[PDB]
Curated annotation (Swiss-Prot):
Main location: cytoplasm
Description of how the protein assembles with itself and partners: Component of a signaling complex containing at least AKAP13, PKN1, MAPK14, ZAK and MAP2K3. Within this complex, AKAP13 interacts directly with PKN1, which in turn recruits MAPK14, MAP2K3 and ZAK. Binds to a kinase interaction motif within the protein tyrosine phosphatase, PTPRR. This interaction retains MAPK14 in the cytoplasm and prevents nuclear accumulation. Interacts with SPAG9 and GADD45A. Interacts with CDC25B, CDC25C, DUSP1, DUSP10, DUSP16, NP60, SUPT20H and TAB1. Interacts with casein kinase II subunits CSNK2A1 and CSNK2B. Interacts with PPM1D.
Source organism of this protein record: Homo sapiens (Human)
The keyword Transferase is assigned to this record: yes
Active site residues according to the UniProt entry: D157
Cofactor(s) needed for function: Mg(2+)
Protein name: Mitogen-activated protein kinase 14
Record's catalysed reaction(s): L-seryl-[protein] + ATP = O-phospho-L-seryl-[protein] + ADP + H(+); L-threonyl-[protein] + ATP = O-phospho-L-threonyl-[protein] + ADP + H(+)
Keywords recorded for this protein, A-Z: Acetylation, Apoptosis, ATP-binding, Cytoplasm, Kinase, Nucleotide-binding, Nucleus, Phosphoprotein, Serine/threonine-protein kinase, Stress response, Transcription, Transcription regulation, Transferase, Ubl conjugation
Amino acid sequence: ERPTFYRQELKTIWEVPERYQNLSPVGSVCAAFDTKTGLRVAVKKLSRPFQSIIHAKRTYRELRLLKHMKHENVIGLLDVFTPARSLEEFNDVYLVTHLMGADLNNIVQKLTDDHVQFLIYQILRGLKYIHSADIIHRDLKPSNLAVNEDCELKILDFRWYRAPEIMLNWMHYNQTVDIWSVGCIMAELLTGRTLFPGTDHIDQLKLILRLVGTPGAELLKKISSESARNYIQSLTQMPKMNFANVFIGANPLAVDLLEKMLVLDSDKRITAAQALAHAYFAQYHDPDDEPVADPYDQSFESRDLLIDEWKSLTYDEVISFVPP
């Protein structure tokens, strides 16, 4: 049976099941109390969800993704509703997720090594799942990582932390773009400072290469553009620094892990699954409690449909939603 909804203004009018109380603003988002569960939640009212073909497809994309994610370290979907009673009336979409405490920016007085391990382990646990569904986050950074009091972490959403190959539009990449990002995050947790605080994309790459070294003949062989090759090999040859002397006093196993994540060639970069079995995580790792995802069907991405069809497909997804 359909809940009872009530209506309220806070620019626009919000129409939500009565189980959600004390909406205070934070599309646009309100913090809410979910009376059914006692949880504090975030209710997002999508703005303009079907204004165009692009809006519609993005609406469908976000809803499908959030429905797929079912993992402790990844934001999932608590509820999705519409005030509409039919496809005819369907104009509004609300998403309900866990209201998350801080993010990792708020946390950045250093963190102990034990606590760095705990945070990074959880990110890698979430990333192993996301990547096992063939999804690449692409923009992992402190503001996309929320923690509660217990300091339990969830990945949300989906340029100091971007892999150089994602930064530079290179088609030679894989899911370990996210692993570069984790390396930058982990480093900043150990030292209190941004690893690569570039001013523009050039300054950023110069800071990266200063630490990792200019590409070696082997990586140069994977570069298909002559102007790109000529560009690279014209730069002054930086040799790979030793990380120990950049992360002084850090746990030697953290430093070793950093050297494996912060590798320019992504075919050689450590993966989320490999990183979880690294000794640095010995107190937290458990290979029977690092679950993987169902395969995630992104064929919709290649389709060009009418507005009314993306709208209908979205409505289908609302209707079939099953809560946790």
